[model samples]
Target: YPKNCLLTVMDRYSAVVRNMEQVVMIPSLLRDVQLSGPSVQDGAPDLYTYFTMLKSICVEVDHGLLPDRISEELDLEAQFHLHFCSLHHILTHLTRKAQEVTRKYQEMTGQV
Candidate 1:
């Protein structure tokens, strides 16, 4: 885990992570990687499951359909809440749930 790691801002709307050696990318050091969260033993699968449950909480998207912090929303009623709980629907819901988990995880971990 780089001994210690940090998520910090580099500029307006720019978040740069640092390791013990500092922003270890410099052109010689710049890099981006997309990964799902938690420890290797848990990984993205838990995130996927978390999202599925979260969607089930509503009945929205597809109840069990799926951003970035592109922002947030909710309903006592509907917003693209589909009427069927298809497999695709479940996956959609799970993906969105994972997104929610991702945001919350980042906030709690001081990552975003």
Candidate 2:
């Protein structure tokens, strides 16, 4: 179903992982290249650091440890929708960023 946020988010996360695979082939080459995008954080020293941070975020959002608390007072269905929608946005952005990083490396190495 198009309304299934969980499935949509999983697809987005899969894209992120696939793009990341294209990058890790030459991760060392990604070192020292300063990220010049709008969302570049102060803590991120270089492209590699940025990629590392993205990977950490991916780990946090990954769904493997199943079965958490079930709140009786709260609308659990609404909560699930909110959480998956937020994760969808995150993984979508991460997928683009991963692709950008891979493109940058390819251009640098004259493989583009």
Candidate 3:
């Protein structure tokens, strides 16, 4: 149907991500990483890389790390950058960490 499975899933994923800032208030989810972004196939990009980044941010906000708290400590702009930094860090961090999980799954099947 599409060029590949990645592109198809990316379309739906990006659509929801696009709403984070417009419908809600989490521009940081995508201000750094994009959904319909580069290709993992092209030596390009990784899906879990950006998706996991978004997950880490949702962790803080879910616990209530709002713009209010941030702006009080710093400023809106600082808060903006902070979010990007945090998300980007976890994206990089979890990629390595999750490799272990994937191995675990493989081991579960006695395949690895």
Candidate 4:
């Protein structure tokens, strides 16, 4: 029960990282990849855009600290729990997107 959400978040984050590692190997190949429908509205016009977006997200998530301004009623540990829960949900979606990008790249290139 302890650190459960944190662990799950890390697991999903790892999946995204690993999948992106594959996608970035030949980044140029991804430049011509088309993104359709909601994906087109999802911030990336191409796979490279998506890859860089994830990189920025990783950096943002990797660095954090407590706010200098806070309420006296604030519960630090409880706040951390809520943050990790939200992060876990976000990473789950990111992991799927990353995997999809990698699979699309491989299918396009006819690589293993």
**Model 4: runs farther than 4 Å from truth?**
1-7, 37-44, 65-112
Instruction: Score every model by TM-score.
Output: 0.25, 0.41, 0.32, 0.40
Tens digits of per-residue lDDT, candidate 1, 27-59, equal: 322122222321234332233343333334333
Off by over 4 Å in 3: 1-74
lDDT of 3: 0.52
lDDT of 2: 0.63
Poorest lDDT segment (10 consecutive residues) of candidate 2 = 65-74
What lDDT is obtained when candidate 1 is compared to the true structure? 0.38
lDDT of 3 by residue, 5-102 (tens): 74465455455655543664553443334335322133332334444455444444444444313214224335655876787688779998899899
lDDT of each: 0.38, 0.63, 0.52, 0.60
CA displacement after TM-score superposition, residue 74 of candidate 3 (Å): 8.3
TM-score for predicted model 2 compared with the true structure: 0.41
Model 3 lDDT-worst window of ten = 67-76
RMSD in Å for all candidates: 21.8, 22.8, 18.2, 22.8
Ranked by lDDT from best down, the candidates are 2, 4, 3, 1
Better of 1 and 3 by TM-score: 3
Cα lDDT, model 4, residue 16: 84
lDDT of 2 by residue, 1-112 (tens): 5746865776577579668968699887878676664243455466676566556445545653122111221343345556767777888899999999999999999996
Judged by whole-model lDDT over C-alpha atoms, candidate 4 comes out at 0.60
**Number of the top-ranking candidate, with TM-score as the measure:** 2
What is the TM-score of candidate 1?
0.25
Candidate closer to the true structure by lDDT (higher is better), 2 or 4: 2
Q: What ranking of all candidate models by TM-score puts the best one first?
A: 2, 4, 3, 1
